[PDB]
Design a protein around this ligand. Structure first.
Ligand code: FGO
Ligand code: CL
Ligand code: CL
Length: 397
């Protein structure tokens, strides 16, 4: 009896049903969301949440845009900060504090990101941070400390790749992995208000990755997630979302390590990219649906819900109270990777919260990165093309 079957039964008997459109395809993220919902729906008297999978996040934004064109929107959806800026163009979003949802205690790294013109429009829900995954066994085998600096990280990848006859730093050639190198080389996407994709720190970041392919220390992954490719050739390291934790744990045939990111110096860890989503509440929803959403949002921000969701997934607990919950404490005392995830969440950067950013990051910036890595395009030429295509897209709206 699958949690989604139990939810279908709950919603059938309910007097009111708030749909929640999401981008979890399966694994621990989809399961944790549904177990949370089952427990919520049990607690209510004929008022229920119905999670509806819409594919991935890009499929979810496409289906939400189509739902507006049809005039049939869900009560709630997942939304990254760029999707919030898009939905605010249509004044489609209910301010969260208008429902009476208390947000005291929500980590300000997460709450500042959902605040637009001083108004909170989203509840942080599944917020990830990039971490350093590694092969504890392969580092021990060659006497290599877990690198704390970018310099150390490059040296380790060179040493281990030479020892093992193959590139040990695995990466997707995408905007998320670029962001780690960009940010920690001192890059910023906004210069005096303007989006800039071809800055010298962008060129430096893409050049480092392309040189790591050429020098035989970096392995581009082109088919599936890094965790779906383990087993083929030697693996030492990747830089990847904390929501990958359970997928890495299931796939790895070696002893898996999680570390804080290599930074410019030992003074501080490297910044990680914040990914994952907020829950938003649509204005088009019925007052009765919005009251369900208010209850469900106060449930999701409860310390026990935050403790169960974060320990099941490797998402970052979004509240201070979650770290004080005994279920979280018992997990963390048995598994030091939860503390390492939280520690990394202190050193956290976001991508621009622009309405156009989904298209930009995938179809323009993502594409320039694949052109340089997979087709050996000059990094500067590839990013100059991305700059002009982004400038054309921004000016057209
Ligand atoms: N639409 C839109 N997408 C965005 C934006 N910024 C980033 N992203 C995408 O969000 C994923 C990170 O979100 P996160 O919740 O941290 O992680 C996801 C999955 O990544 C990850 N996962 C799933 C299966 C698996 O084998 N391994 C695994 O790691 O687990 C989670 C549940 O699906 C990136 C990765 C991507 O999905 O492949 C493309 C990128 C944005 O601004 N807009
Ligand atoms: Cl493996
Ligand atoms: Cl990308």
């Amino acid at each position: 009896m699958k949690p989604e079957d139990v939810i279908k039964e709950q919603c059938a008997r309910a007097k009111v049903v708030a749909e929640l459109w999401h981008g979890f395809t399966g694994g621990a993220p989809k399961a944790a969301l549904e177990n949370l919902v089952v427990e919520f729906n049990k607690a209510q008297q004929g008022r229920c949440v119905r999670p509806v999978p819409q594919g991935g996040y890009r499929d979810l934004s496409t289906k939400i845009k189509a739902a507006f064109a049809a005039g049939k929107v869900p009560t709630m959806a997942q939304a990254a900060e760029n999707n919030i800026a898009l939905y605010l163009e249509a004044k489609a979003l209910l301010p969260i504090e208008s429902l009476g949802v208390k947000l005291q205690g929500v980590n300000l790294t997460f709450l500042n990101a959902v605040r637009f013109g001083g108004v909170v429009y989203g509840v942080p829900f599944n917020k990830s941070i990039q971490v350093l995954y590694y092969n504890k066994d392969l580092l021990k085998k060659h006497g290599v400390p877990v690198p704390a600096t970018l310099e150390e990280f490059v040296a380790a990848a060179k040493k281990l790749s030479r020892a093992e006859g193959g590139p040990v730093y695995w990466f997707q050639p995408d905007a998320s992995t670029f962001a780690y190198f960009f940010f920690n080389l001192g890059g910023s996407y906004l210069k005096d208000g303007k989006l800039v994709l071809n800055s010298k720190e962008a060129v430096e970041a893409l050049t480092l990755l392309q040189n790591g392919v050429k020098e035989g220390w970096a392995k581009p992954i082109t088919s599936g997630y890094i965790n779906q490719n383990l087993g083929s050739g030697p693996y030492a390291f990747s830089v990847d979302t904390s929501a990958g934790y359970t997928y890495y744990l299931r796939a790895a045939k070696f002893d898996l390590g999680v570390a804080t990111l290599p930074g410019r110096t030992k003074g501080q860890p490297g910044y990680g990219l914040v990914q994952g989503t907020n829950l938003v509440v649509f204005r088009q929803a019925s007052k009765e649906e919005q009251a369900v959403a208010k209850d469900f949002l106060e449930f999701v921000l409860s310390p026990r819900a935050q403790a169960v969701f974060a320990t099941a997934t490797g998402y970052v607990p979004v509240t201070e109270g979650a770290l004080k919950d005994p279920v979280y404490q018992a997990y963390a005392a048995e598994n030091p990777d939860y503390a390492t995830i939280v520690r990394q969440s202190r050193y956290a950067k976001f991508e621009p919260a622009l309405a156009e950013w989904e298209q930009i990051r995938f179809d323009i910036l993502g594409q320039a990165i694949k052109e340089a890595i997979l087709n050996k395009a000059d990094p500067k030429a590839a990013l100059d093309r991305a700059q002009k295509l982004a400038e054309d897209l921004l000016s057209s709206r």
